[PDB]
């Protein structure tokens, strides 16, 4: 059976391969080599799990194919679903309905988790009879007890607007919303022809009628969208408002979350914001981050740029990493070193093990020698390519000849630029 | 008012090209948006997993029922085997259908939940200078807002009230051409098309039209216009001298006679 | 019916050993390119891989697009094939990032077994039993049926305004009663079949339809009815909590054994038109585990990337994205290959041509281009049929070549600067 | 909770007796 | 068009009270029902706009707003 | 009550005589005689108001009193005459075109005043009797000269009950529309306090006649007229600036109807002034539209401030004086403001420090004039407030020279800031 998330580029990264003392192992769970960069990743991951401070930023820099996104995915996988890890690209902010600043604001607020716990007394039971004359009575039922309730004006109005019939397992809370939870217990045989799209006959509840329902759910600090309109939950599934007013975003929601945390009804859990390829950001977003990192409850940023001394978009000034120095000053730069003949073959072997490709030692050697001359991801793709070419060859073990067949079939950037002599 | 309503004369087979009863999938099992405002977190997370109707109990319940109690305490030819077998088999199919549908109508849980949405939702006025509805002075939200500040904001009703003095005299723009209802449709349509649109329009008219009563005043002025009742009197020197004489004479308090010789002039 | 540019392409002409035949399945020449296309299409049939892009690079007039269409045809209809021109990304209603994400999630297909059932027929009686149920009588040309419907379906019946004599559909799964009209005996004919229609729907759906269905709510009875109007504009589905839940529910259904995943294939044309921001978001998103397999097509060589104006790269694609993308080169055709392609186009369009005419047509193709020699086919047959001759002689193509100039003689004439 | 059933037993006995 | 204006209460009722929040207008003259001709002038763009953004009546088309 | 004293709060109007002869330091303004006389001439032509669409361009050095002359003209023109101040950068909107924003700015400084003679009844209610069976009742209205009785009708009683007017209350009744308006409580309005009463603000009863005929006036701008006539949403003037009125009959009809009103004597015209500060921000399209927008008969007068000289026009690469194309510069009358001399800078500083209530010594004035002649008059002015705070901190009475020197050493002007920018400073 095939799942939605089959093996991809970084599927082999099943967490960050460190020790109890953050010491990087040579061969570990997915990650390989890059000892210093991986130890720095573990340090920032511990700083994350701590969450005592805000406004931290680490920038992983290195040549393309050194494992920046690999370390990012390792940190993401090591940071369980408990805390949010919002991984956005460097171009997911250039929106048409949102400005280049509200996008970063929403991304920040999305990386701050909040575990809400709610308690409520609930009445649940099968409705036996509803008499009405206005005032009336209601006979709820459960295998443990059967009761009587006198209904008031609002109760009767809600009951009539919900059209609850006999046998329906009604559910009533204080400050009655009157959730018609389940369908009918009895009065079956409607399946003879049809059932309502909302009918879920499942049997009548057991146990006591009244109960205390404690419900815990993890939301994000972006819940301002859940207030920014009349029907708010709807705007949470699509683009939504162009931008929620600051006069509410930055004061009202924050104060209410503080009150919740003081009363003990909720608790904030900061997360991580991984902005990949941040070199595309304009100087405006960088000047915004300059102050955003100064705020009180900002998440920790993880940037991954592969550009050296290059021009900053929107301007003509060259700078390291292609971003402003006033922003680089507030970061913490880690460096990833290029892989060697020893590490390239190791990660290639791990990638072969991923899809369970049995490769010979000569094939491993030749593929490593190829990838050390052209590119790493090129040799990674050659793994699956040769695997398929040999599976069609009625083979079981990929060999040097099948690897060279693919090497000749599929070109790389270098050989393609070389063969581009015709100039159409 | 253009009598020639440009009704669309499109073809008939195209009125509904997507309707196909036996060629569509049950998207209901993927409807997450519809759960947020109808289904509760406690419903899907705690109740269903334990109270899911089992096929055993479903088969068992199909038996002889019992009558309800009667409380009054005031103290402390022969049949066909083929036919009966077909009846039994169709009944079994019915029971399997209920087992399937009841289990399929509760497979997916909400993304947030009713209680989660109710907890996240604050008083409808979030950052407005006017306070929300307060049940009474028993909590802060009543004593934390001022009526002097509440008066500082004018609703559209108060805006219309205060602009009514100029709305009566400054709204005069008549549109150059008026069109009847947007466009009819000449068609051989499926009979079930017009009833739904009619019901939708009736619902909208019953819901919103009562709320549009205030804008009727502006609609009248923007739909029709009439003379100011002084249009020519502003320039009629004869009528102006007549009014001057009348106003100078009414201060004395004596009877006055006027003579005219034309029914229309009298009018 | 009507012929198209790639309608003659039936698929990759590869034998059981993977080697490409000189001429088969409508494709000729390009043996290495066709073999690479087959190697990568085997990946699509394996379905155990994700986040892979293959770039067909070559000059204009080459069979890159033809090879993409051949891949699509060989794959068939069970797996989706989403074509998209790089120009289409520049949308004004929704951002380019989300257009790309929507196309990526729409490429992925999803087959599911829908076991629906609908009762159909003319109404003979409606009796609601404050309603425990409603008894309805249905009639068809197989007998009469008495049906017990949930009181919630009585509301739908009343809203559809059905009464004794009208033909209706009532779906057991949802209660979507639809009034087809009034019976012909009083209009639509009486349905002639088993009133209890029970059959399995194996119809396929895409993974983007699931997101489109949840983007906006469908219903009414409240102010929500106002939402049906207002342009219904397409807007960004947030990656945070919508497509993740869609993936979760699809995984739940696949585990339960109802749904079945069939990864599709994307096909981007004129990739050089995408901005550098689209390029980098693409090389970032295609690394995900749920991304489909994509086929890029390039039409130009070393040029400047759009949005940079200061950085040149091969094929107008930045190196950051060109790495991790397998490059299949498509080269120009020879005179014999051009003649073969012209003959295939002719015998597919339905025109019979003499040998001397086909020879000079292949000569014209080698002189100006294969696509031009191909375009010169129809008008020659038209002139022939006008003159009475059913076939094309050499006197027709060499006379239509004077009526329809090419992209080279046109420029030679424009050289006058006026 | 079980007070309901304890009372139901008594009332059923009373009804069966009368 | 279907529009109806309230010119005010008949002048004969002005003697009913000393003061009222009512506009008074005398009895309309002439025939109750009257057809009149008007030579109006409008541009093609006027019809274009009238048919593109219709207002009309008899419906809830005010949702145009 | 509390509206702070801005940079231009010291000028109360042009210091001119009856013959438009500018005085040296009268009415807040100081020096700049030629430009002040030109401002007075244009202001007289404005108050006359029989010519439409005239443009003036006040060019000059930075900080020589151009915006000062503009605010002085505004003050001397006072209310009852539209004066709209706009920066050149305010028309660059996202929901409306530049030409539409300019049309709005123009039509916003054109006033239409409808004068009406609606009669009313003003008096102090003595009694409001009403019997419900349609309910019928009576009212007793009293003024200091006479008393009278009125039989209340159905809608009259309805409106009286809705407004909740009671005895002792002074009210005005619009007999035409029946609109009630209570102005206050008379001494009789005393409710004989024996219950939850918390209002005792009394006022004299109305004097004069019972049923008097006073005159009302409704003044609204052509901008407001077309905005409220655009669509059924007749509140965009306050609701939000969402606009885009088509130039179809709507605006042409406003113009035609205002013409008929002027002809028939309903409301004729009151022209206005549009002060465009920093007009160099306008685009070539803006200038090209203004070229012909100044030609309309409903065009108010405009005055555009200019600091630029020979500089490129925004939106193009054409070098033109004032940053404005000669096409538009030809319609304008150019007034040049000259730099202030020593005695003019000193007098300006004196008036400013006397307006902001700061007593400076005779040597403080000298050192401040020195600083203001070596550096910008604006910097010299801003130095006064900063120097007064150190004095108040040390518990002084009048600003001395040592406080001004401390403030000069503490704060930096642009020149000294640039000369201190000797390091890279993240260029
Ligand atoms: N240290 C490592 N451990 C495991 N796999 C690695 C490692 N380094 C590289 N790889 C493999 O090489 C591939 C390319 O690395 P990638 O993360 O794309 O580099 P970059 O981060 O510079 O883009 C990854 O998909 C990963 O599977
Ligand atoms: N291998 C081939 N065999 C037969 N016909 C081909 C082959 N390659 C290309 N053609 C024809 O030549 C034309 C080239 O079209 P296209 O594939 O769009 O070129 P490009 O490579 O520039 O995309 C098409 O009409 C196609 O039918
Ligand atoms: N003639 C004057 N009389 C009094 N104050 C003046 C005079 N001219 C300029 N000022 C003052 O100088 C300050 C700045 O000059 P300003 O009028 O803004 O000239 P500009 O507009 O050219 O900068 C203002 O606060 C103003 O009060």
The domain that holds C91 is classified in CATH as 3.40.50.300
- With contact defined as beta carbons under 8 Å apart, do A27 and A353 qualify? no
Specify whether the CB–CB gap between B173 and B222 falls below 8 A: yes
Tokens of F211: 């049923």
Closest Cα to atom 15, ligand 3: which residue?
Answer: F63
A5, A8, A194, A224: best mutation site toward chain C, by most C Cβ within 10 Å?
A194
State the Cα–Cα distance between residues F122 and F207, nearest whole angstrom: 9
Q: Contact at 8 Å (CB) between C332 and C62?
A: yes
Task: Tell me which chain F residues have a C-beta less than 8 angstroms from the C-beta of B221.
Answer: none
C-alpha distances out from residue A299 to A61, A179, A244, A268, F253, Å: 20, 37, 19, 11, 58
Per the structure block, which two tokens stand in for A12? Answer: 């082999």
Question: Is F281 near ligand 3, meaning CB less than 6 Å away?
Answer: no
What is the C-alpha separation between F89 and F286, in angstroms, rounded?
A: 11
What is the number of domains present in chain C? 3
* Cα(F251)–Cα(F256) distance, integer angstroms: 9
CA-nearest residue of chain C to A3?
Answer: C251
Number of neighbours of residue B232 by Cβ within 10 angstroms: 11
- Extract the runs of DSSP E, i.e. beta strands, from A199-299: 210-220, 266-270, 272-276
The three-class DSSP label of residue F191 is: coil
Chains E and D in direct contact, meaning 3 or more beta-carbon pairs closer than 8 angstroms? no
User: What whole-number distance in Å separates Cα of residue F162 and Cα of residue F169?
Assistant: 15
Residue B261: phi and psi, rounded to 5, are -135, 60
Tell me, what CATH number does C157's domain have? Answer: 2.40.50.360
Do both C16 and C74 map to the same domain? yes
d(CA F280, CA F314): 7
Check the CA dihedral A184-A188-A194-A200 and report its sign: positive
- Which atom of ligand 3 is found nearest the CA of F29? 3
Chains with 3 or more CB pairs under 8 A to chain C: A, B
Q: Are residues C96 and C237 in the same domain?
A: yes
Structural domain ending residue among the three candidates C213, C247, C274? C213
Among C184, C213, C242, give the residue marking a domain's end.
C213
Query: CA quadruple C231, C234, C236, C237: dihedral positive or negative?
Result: positive
Q: Are residues C143 and C125 in the same domain?
A: yes
In terms of domains, do C219 and C319 share one? yes
Annotated binding residue at A83? no
**Contacts with B119 from chain A: Cβ below 8 Å:** 116, 118
Q: Is F381 in the pocket of ligand 3 (CB under 6 A)?
A: yes
Q: What does A102-127 look like in DSSP terms, one character per residue?
A: HHHHHHHHHTEEEEEEEEEEEEEEEE
Residue whose Cα lies nearest atom 12 of ligand 2: it is C63
CA distances from A2 to A130, B88, C262 (A): 51, 40, 9
Residue of B92, B190, B86, B78 whose CA lies nearest to C143 = B86
Six token digits for residue C382: 């038209």
Are residues B113 and C241 in contact, defined by beta-carbon separation less than 8 angstroms?
no
F343 lines ligand 3 (CB under 6 A): no
Residues of B in contact with A213 (CB under 8 A): 42, 46
Exposed/middle/buried for residue A229 (C-beta within 10 Å: 0-12, 13-18, 19+) = middle
Contact partners for chain D, using 3 or more CB pairs closer than 8 A, are A, B
Contact F212, F120 (CB under 8 A): yes
In terms of DSSP H, where are the helices of A176-269? 232-235, 246-248, 254-263
Q: What is the dihedral of CA E39, E45, E46, E50, to 10 degrees?
A: 140
The residue to which tokens 């790639």 are assigned: C6
Residue F333: name the closest of F44, F42, F20, F77 by CA: F42
Tell which of B57, B71, B101 to mutate to test the A interface (max A CBs under 10 Å): B101
- Say yes or no for a CB contact (<8 Å) between D4 and A146: yes
- Out of F27, F340, F348, mutate this one to test ligand 3's pocket (max ligand atoms within 8 Å of CB): namely F348
Ligand 3 centroid to Cα of residue F64, in Å, is 5
Does one domain contain both C117 and C92?
no
Asked if F33 and F277 count as a contact pair (C-beta separation under 8 A), the reply is no
Helices (H), C368-408: 370-375, 377-387, 394-403
Is residue C303 within 8 A of residue C312, CB to CB? The reply is yes
Same domain, yes or no: C317 and C223: yes
H or E element in which residue F128 lies = strand F120-131
What CA–CA distances, in Å, run from B265 to B259, C366, E28?
A: 10, 97, 14
Q: Is C58 annotated as a binding residue?
A: yes
Residue C401 sits in the same domain as residue C264: no
Ligand 2, pocket residues at CB < 6 Å: C 5-6, 8-9, 26-30, 58, 60-66, 299, 330, 341, 344, 370-371
Interface of A with B in 79-108 (CB under 8 A): none
CB A299 within 8 A of CB A108: yes
Give the best residue of F119, F123, F129, F178 to mutate against chain E (max E CB count within 10 A): F178
CB neighbours of residue A58 within 10 Å: 23
Residues closing a segment before a gap in chain B (C–N exceeding 2.5 Å): 76
Closest ligand by atom to C342 CA: 2
Final residue belonging to a domain, choices C332, C353, C378: C332
Beta bridge partners of C183: C188
The DSSP secondary structure of A9-23, one letter per residue, reads SSTT--S--B-TT-P
Contacts of A83 by beta carbon, 8 Å cutoff, 6+ apart:
A48, A49, A51, A113, A269, A270, A271, A272
3-state SS class at A420: coil
One domain, residues C99 and C29: yes
**Which two three-digit tokens encode residue C379?**
């008008």
Residues 6+ apart with CB under 8 A from A114: A218, A219, A220, A221, A223, A257, A266, A267, A268, A269
3-state secondary structure of A397: strand
Ligand 1 binding pocket mutation candidate from A9, A347, A368 (most atoms within 8 A of CB):
A347
Burial (CB < 10 A; 0-12, 13-18, 19+), residue C114, is middle
- C61 is in which domain, residue-wise? 1-106+214-332
CA B230 to chain centre: 43
The residue assigned the tokens 């939106």 is: F315
- Binding site per annotation, positions of F for ATP: 60-67
Say whether both C143 and C66 belong to one domain.
no
Question: From the CB of F179, is ligand 3 less than 6 Å away?
Answer: no
Structure tokens at F44: 């007289």
CB distance from C110 to chain A under 8 Å?
no
What is the C-alpha to C-alpha distance for residues B249 and B256, in angstroms, rounded to an integer? Answer: 8
Closest by CA position to F175, among listed F205, F206, F152: F152
Q: Say if residues D8 and A145 touch (Cβ distance below 8 Å).
A: no
Cβ of F156 within 8 Å of Cβ of E17? The answer is yes
Residue C412 half-sphere exposure, CB side, CA atoms within 13 Å? 5
CB A187 within 8 A of CB A164: no
Among the bound ligands, name the one nearest to the CA of residue A8: 1
What token pair was written down for B167? Answer: 């709305």
Long-range residue pairs from F400-405, CB within 8 A, at least 24 positions apart, any chain:
F400/F361, F400/F363, F400/F364, F401/F361, F401/F363, F401/F364, F401/F366, F401/F367, F403/F364, F404/F364, F404/F367, F404/F368, F404/F371, F405/F367
Strand order in the sheet with C204-206: C204-206, C109-112, C259-262
Joined together, the tokens standing for residue F379 give 């910097």
**C-alpha to C-alpha distance for D9 and E7, rounded to whole angstroms:** 79
Residue F344 alpha carbon to ligand 3 centre in Å: 10
Broken C–N links (> 2.5 Å) in chain E, after residues: none
Beta strands in C216-282 (DSSP E): 259-262, 265-269
Q: How far is the CA of B113 from the centre of ligand 3 (A)?
A: 63
For chain C positions 168-207, those within 8 Å of chain A (CB to CB) are 170-175
In angstroms, what is the span from residue A65 Cα to ligand 1's centroid? 6
Q: Compute the distance from residue C66 Cα to the ligand 2 centre, in Å.
A: 5
| 3-state secondary structure (DSSP) of residue F183 | strand
Cβ-based contacts of A96 with chain F (< 8 Å)? none
Q: Using an 8 Å Cβ cutoff, are A196 and C152 in contact?
A: yes
Q: Do E1 and B208 touch (CB under 8 A)?
A: no
**In contact, C406 and C366? CB cutoff 8 Å:** no
Cα(A204)–Cα(A185) distance, integer angstroms: 6
Same domain, C201 and C325: no
Cβ of residue F253 closer than 8 Å to a chain B Cβ:
yes
- Tell me the two tokens of residue F45: 């032509």
Q: Coil, helix or strand for F238?
A: helix
Distance between first and last Cα of chain B: 31
Selection from C378, C361, C320, C300 nearest residue C64 by Cα: C300
- Could you give the residue ranges of the DSSP H alpha helices within C54-117? 64-75, 96-107
Q: Which residue of C has its CA nearest to A422?
A: C59
Ligand 3 centre distance from Cα of residue F63 (Å) = 6
Domains of chain A: 8-112+220-339 (3.40.50.300), 340-424 (1.10.8.60)
Does A68 carry a binding-site annotation?
Answer: yes
Could you give the C-alpha distances from F397 to A370, B244, F352, F365, in angstroms and in order? 86, 68, 18, 15
Hey, what are D4's tokens? 């309901």
Neighbours of C152 (CB within 10 A): 21
Helix axes C31-46, A376-392, angle to 10 degrees: 90
Residues C221 and C321 occupy one common structural domain:
yes
d(CA D7, CA D4): 5
- Between CA E54 and CA E61 the distance in angstroms is 8
Separation of alpha carbons F64 and F345, rounded Å: 10
**Rounded distance between C-alpha atoms, residue A286 and residue A305, angstroms:** 14
A376 lines ligand 1 (CB under 6 A): yes
> Same domain, yes or no, for C322 and C222?
yes
- How many residues would you count in chain F? 427
- The rounded Å distance from CA B197 to ligand 1 centre is 58
CA atoms within 13 A on the CB side of A323: 29
Query: If DSSP codes are grouped into helix, strand and coil, which group holds residue C161?
Result: coil
């Amino acid at each position: 059976v095939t799942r939605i998330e089959r093996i991809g580029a970084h599927s082999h990264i099943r967490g960050l391969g460190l020790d109890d003392a953050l010491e990087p192992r040579q061969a570990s769970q997915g990650m390989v080599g890059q000892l210093a960069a991986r130890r720095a990743a573990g340090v920032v991951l511990e700083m994350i799990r701590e969450g005592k401070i805000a406004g931290r930023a680490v920038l992983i820099a290195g040549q393309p194919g050194t494992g920046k996104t690999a370390i990012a995915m390792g940190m993401a996988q090591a940071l369980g679903p408990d805390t949010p890890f919002t991984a956005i690209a460097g171009s997911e902010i250039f929106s048409l309905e949102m400005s280049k600043t509200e996008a970063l604001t929403q991304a920040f607020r999305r990386s701050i988790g909040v575990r809400i716990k709610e308690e409520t007394e609930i009445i649940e039971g099968e409705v036996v009879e509803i008499q009405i004359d206005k005032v009336g009575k209601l006979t709820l039922k459960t295998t443990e007890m059967e009761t009587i309730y006198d209904l008031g004006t609002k109760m009767i109005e809600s009951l009539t607007k919900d059209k609850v019939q006999a046998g329906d397992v009604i559910t009533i809370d204080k400050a009655t919303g009157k959730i018609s939870k389940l369908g009918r217990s009895f009065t079956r045989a409607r399946d003879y022809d049809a059932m309502g799209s909302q009918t879920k006959f499942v049997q009548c509840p057991d146990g006591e009628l009244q109960k205390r329902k404690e419900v815990v759910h993890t939301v994000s600090l972006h819940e301002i969208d859940v207030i920014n309109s009349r029907t708010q939950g709807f705007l949470a599934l699509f683009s939504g408002d162009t931008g929620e007013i600051k006069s509410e975003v930055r004061e009202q929601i924050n104060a209410k979350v503080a009150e919740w945390r003081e009363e003990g009804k909720a608790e904030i859990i900061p997360g991580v914001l991984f902005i990949d390829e941040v070199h595309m950001l304009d100087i405006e977003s960088f000047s915004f981050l300059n102050r955003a990192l100064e705020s009180d409850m900002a998440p920790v940023l993880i940037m991954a740029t592969n550009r050296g001394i290059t021009r900053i978009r929107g301007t003509s000034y060259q700078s390291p990493h292609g971003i402003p120095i006033d922003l680089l000053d507030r970061l913490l730069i880690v460096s990833t070193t290029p892989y060697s003949e020893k590490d390239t073959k190791q990660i290639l072997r791990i990638r072969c093990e991923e899809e369970d490709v049995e490769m010979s030692e000569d094939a491993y050697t030749v593929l490593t020698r190829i990838g050390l001359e052209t590119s790493l991801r090129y040799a990674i793709q050659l793994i699956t390519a040769a695997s398929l070419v040999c599976r069609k060859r009625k083979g079981t073990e990929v060999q040097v000849d099948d690897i060279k067949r693919v090497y000749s079939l599929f070109l790389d950037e270098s050989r393609s630029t070389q063969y581009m002599k015709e100039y159409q | 008012i253009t009598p020639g309503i440009c009704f669309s004369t499109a073809s008939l087979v195209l009125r509904a090209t997507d309707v196909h009863p036996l060629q569509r999938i049950d998207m209901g099992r993927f409807d997450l948006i519809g759960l947020e405002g109808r289904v509760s977190r406690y419903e899907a997370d705690t109740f269903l997993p334990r109270h899911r109707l089992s096929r055993r109990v479903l088969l068992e319940v199909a038996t002889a029922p019992d009558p309800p109690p009667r409380p009054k305490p005031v103290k402390m030819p022969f049949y066909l085997d083929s036919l009966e077998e077909k009846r039994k088999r169709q009944r079994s199919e019915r029971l399997e259908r209920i087992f399937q549908l009841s289990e399929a109508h509760g497979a997916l849980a909400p993304v947030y939940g009713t209680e989660v949405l109710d907890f996240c939702t604050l008083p409808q006025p979030v950052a407005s200078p006017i306070g929300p509805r307060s049940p009474g002075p028993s909590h802060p939200t009543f004593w934390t807002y001022t009526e002097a500040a509440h008066r500082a904001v004018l609703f559209p009703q108060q805006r219309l009230d205060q602009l009514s003095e100029i709305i009566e005299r400054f709204i005069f723009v008549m549109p150059p051409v008026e069109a009847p209802p947007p466009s009819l449709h000449a068609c051989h349509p499926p009979p079930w098309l017009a009833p739904r649109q009619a019901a939708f329009q009736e619902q909208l008219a019953s819901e919103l039209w009562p709320r549009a009563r205030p804008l009727h005043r502006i609609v009248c002025n923007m739909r029709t216009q009439f003379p100011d009742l002084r249009l020519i009197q502003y320039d009629c020197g004869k009528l102006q001298t007549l009014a001057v004489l009348l106003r100078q004479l009414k201060a004395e308090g004596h009877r006055v006679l006027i003579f005219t010789q034309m029914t229309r002039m009298l009018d | 019916q009507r012929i198209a540019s790639h309608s003659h392409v039936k698929g990759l002409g590869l034998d059981e050993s993977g080697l490409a035949k000189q001429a088969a399945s409508g494709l000729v020449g390009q043996e290495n390119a066709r073999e690479a296309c087959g190697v990568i299409v085997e990946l699509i049939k394996s379905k155990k891989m994700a986040g892979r892009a293959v770039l067909l690079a070559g000059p204009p007039g080459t069979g890159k697009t033809a090879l993409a269409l051949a891949i699509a045809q060989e794959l068939g209809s069970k797996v989706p094939f989403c074509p998209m021109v790089g120009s289409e990304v520049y949308s004004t209603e929704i951002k380019k990032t989300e257009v790309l994400m929507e196309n990526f999630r729409r490429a992925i297909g999803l087959r599911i077994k829908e076991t629906k059932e609908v009762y159909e027929g003319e109404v003979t009686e409606l009796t609601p039993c404050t309603i425990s149920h409603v008894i309805i009588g249905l009639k068809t040309a197989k007998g009469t049926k008495q049906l017990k419907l949930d009181p919630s379906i009585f509301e739908s019946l009343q809203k559809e305004r059905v009464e004794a004599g009208d033909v209706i559909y009532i779906e057991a799964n949802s209660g979507a009663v639809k009034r087809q009209g009034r019976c012909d005996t009083y209009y639509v004919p009486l349905p002639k079949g088993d009133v209890h229609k029970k059959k399995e729907i194996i119809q396929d759906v895409t993974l983007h339809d699931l997101d489109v269905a949840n983007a906006r709510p469908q219903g009414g009875q409240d102010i929500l009815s106002m939402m049906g109007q207002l342009m219904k504009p397409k807007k960004t589905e947030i990656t945070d909590k919508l497509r993740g839940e869609i993936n979760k529910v699809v995984n739940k259904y696949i585990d339960q054994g109802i749904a079945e995943l069939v990864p599709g294939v994307l096909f981007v044309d004129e990739v050089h038109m995408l901005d550098i921001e689209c390029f980098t978001y693409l090389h970032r998103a295609l690394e995900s585990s749920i991304a489909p397999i994509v086929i890029f097509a390039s039409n130009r060589g070393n040029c400047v990337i759009r949005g940079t104006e200061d950085i040149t790269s091969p094929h107008g694609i930045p190196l950051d994205l060109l790495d991790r993308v397998m490059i299949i080169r498509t080269m120009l055709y020879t005179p014999q290959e051009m003649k073969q392609i012209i003959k295939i186009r002719a015998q597919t369009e339905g025109i019979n041509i003499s040998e001397e005419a086909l020879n000079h047509l292949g000569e014209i193709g080698t002189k100006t281009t294969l696509r031009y020699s191909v375009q010169l086919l129809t008008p020659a047959n038209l002139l022939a049929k006008i003159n009475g001759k059913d076939s094309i002689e050499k006197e027709h193509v060499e006379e239509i070549s004077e009526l329809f100039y090419d992209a080279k003689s046109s420029a030679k004439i424009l050289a006058d600067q006026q | 909770a079980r007070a309901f059933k304890i009372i139901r037993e008594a009332y059923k006995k009373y009804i069966t007796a009368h | 068009s279907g529009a109806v204006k309230r010119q005010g209460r008949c002048d004969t009722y002005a003697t009913e009270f000393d003061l009222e929040a009512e506009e008074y207008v005398p009895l309309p003259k002439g025939d109750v029902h009257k057809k009149k001709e008007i030579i109006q002038d409008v541009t093609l763009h006027d019809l274009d706009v009238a048919n593109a953004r219709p207002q009309g009546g008899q419906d809830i088309l005010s949702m145009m707003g």
